[PDB]
Design a protein around this ligand. Structure first.
Ligand SMILES: C[C@@H](NC(=O)CCS)C(=O)O
Ligand SMILES: C[C@@H](NC(=O)CCS)C(=O)O
Ligand SMILES: [Zn+2]
Ligand SMILES: [Zn+2]
Ligand SMILES: [Zn+2]
Ligand SMILES: [Zn+2]
Lengths: 266, 266
């Protein structure tokens, strides 16, 4: 007599859940997540912005890192997201409860976030998290300005429909640094061709490769740092080997073309 | 047989003309003038702002200090002024020629600057400099925003009709710092009572004391640093003894009341 299976928790490599101290990227930009998941704090005279939070259990760690940086819960003004999967948007609901932060996201990301990542086009209910509501819906190319830092949304659908690259200009050693936080361009276990839930998946990915290639991009960061060749545990050399946006897009496209061939064969 | 006198150059204490390296005031704000004359550089992702230039001969020194800070001539976007006397606006014409900078000033300051400080209400033609044109006229309370730093004009007529306090918020050790660059509140050799060229001089000064007292003012700076108890040659302790805006206003008012009594007696 065989019962139905137990629910399976979304488990991940230890490095994804390994806390790290804040790592400075530019004068007002810091990595405050874990060794293998990005969560970017951008510190402004008019309050702080967080781009991604990582996994659901990273909430208190993020708040601790913010505190270390001189950012109290009420100082957090905005949360922005690369995409609404559990390993990047996971703590967003809790962050909203515990801080003054409002979430801006595109329509697709907002809808997936509000579902807590359930009914995912590819994952189903395999990888879910506490749902959260967006406070503001953003359009492609729309800018949001916080204490003088201008964040621009660049839609790059594929990994999720609502996948977004966020760009802004910070400063370092006296000069401006155009940072590109480009979303994932992977398709882990995705049915790419003739997917009834995403009929134009392939065409969106191709447009997203071109979008990522063309971003203003002195420094590239990615939700999974390894994808842009970042090593957050490497301290002063964390970003030394980082890819350009062009190289990141090219690598993603070559990998995607291989996955297409393997799927056709499969 | 006695000829007319030679023109007298406007000569000043050596300390007013003594170059100093850039002295940091806050994260994006630096003193870049001389030991005894203020010239503030505020560095922005969207270019730099200069508040005052000091004496006419400080132009190249200022440009050198800007270079040291990573600001090239074309990076200087805006010049703002406390007041248009030779020892604060002196190099402005040359700075405009040698950089991309445009000048914003109120109507009174613009008119005095365009005259190169000639026909001064109190000094006549004693203290003059190369004339310069304003590119933008500002009104009381008007804000100008450069790469996210918001500068607000607070008119404080008296020392000159167009005397202005400029306020902005920078950051330091993680926290915001509300900087007040308050203009001079002195009246050196001025006829205060029944001055036909400035009939409401006394009333303007009194209103200006109240204005200066009420400014947003975590840190006060003044065109002559001694007036706010700054010692730019004191390095890490330059600003330690700095007055509050309230104390500066109170001191100025007590001094002014004394000058009124002495004039009545005189
Ligand atoms: C590393 C892998 N990521 C995941 O499986 C979690 C959702 S992005 C990928 O995007 O290929
Ligand atoms: C120090 C003295 N300044 C000058 O004589 C030059 C014009 S502000 C003052 O304002 O009292
Ligand atoms: Zn994902
Ligand atoms: Zn992920
Ligand atoms: Zn003066
Ligand atoms: Zn002066």
């Amino acid at each position: 007599e065989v019962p139905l299976p137990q629910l399976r928790a979304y488990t991940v490599d230890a490095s994804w859940l390994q806390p790290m101290a804040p790592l400075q990227i530019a004068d007002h930009t810091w990595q405050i997540g874990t060794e293998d998941l990005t969560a970017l704090l951008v510190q402004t005279p008019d309050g702080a912005v967080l781009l991604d939070g990582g996994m659901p259990q990273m909430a208190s760690h993020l708040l601790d890192n913010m505190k270390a940086r001189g950012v109290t819960p009420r100082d957090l003004r905005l949360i922005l997201l690369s995409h609404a999967h559990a390993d990047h948007a996971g703590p967003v609901a809790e962050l909203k409860r515990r801080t003054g932060a409002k979430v801006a996201a595109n329509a697709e990301s907002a809808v997936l976030l509000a579902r807590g990542g359930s009914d995912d086009l590819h994952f189903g209910d395999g990888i879910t998290y506490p749902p959260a509501n967006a406070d503001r819906i953003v359009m492609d190319g729309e800018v949001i300005t916080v204490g003088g830092i201008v964040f621009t949304a660049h839609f790059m659908a594929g990994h999720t429909p609502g996948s977004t690259a966020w760009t802004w200009t910070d400063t370092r050693n006296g000069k401006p640094v155009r940072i590109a936080y480009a979303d994932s361009l992977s398709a882990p276990g995705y049915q790419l061709q003739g997917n009834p839930r995403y009929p134009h998946l392939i065409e969106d990915y191709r447009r997203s490769f071109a979008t990522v290639r063309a971003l203003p991009c002195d420094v590239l960061l990615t939700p999974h740092p390894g994808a842009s060749n970042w090593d957050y545990a490497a301290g002063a050399r964390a970003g030394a080997k980082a890819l350009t946006c062009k190289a990141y897009a090219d690598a993603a496209e070559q990998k995607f073309d291989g996955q297409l061939a393997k799927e056709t064969a499969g």
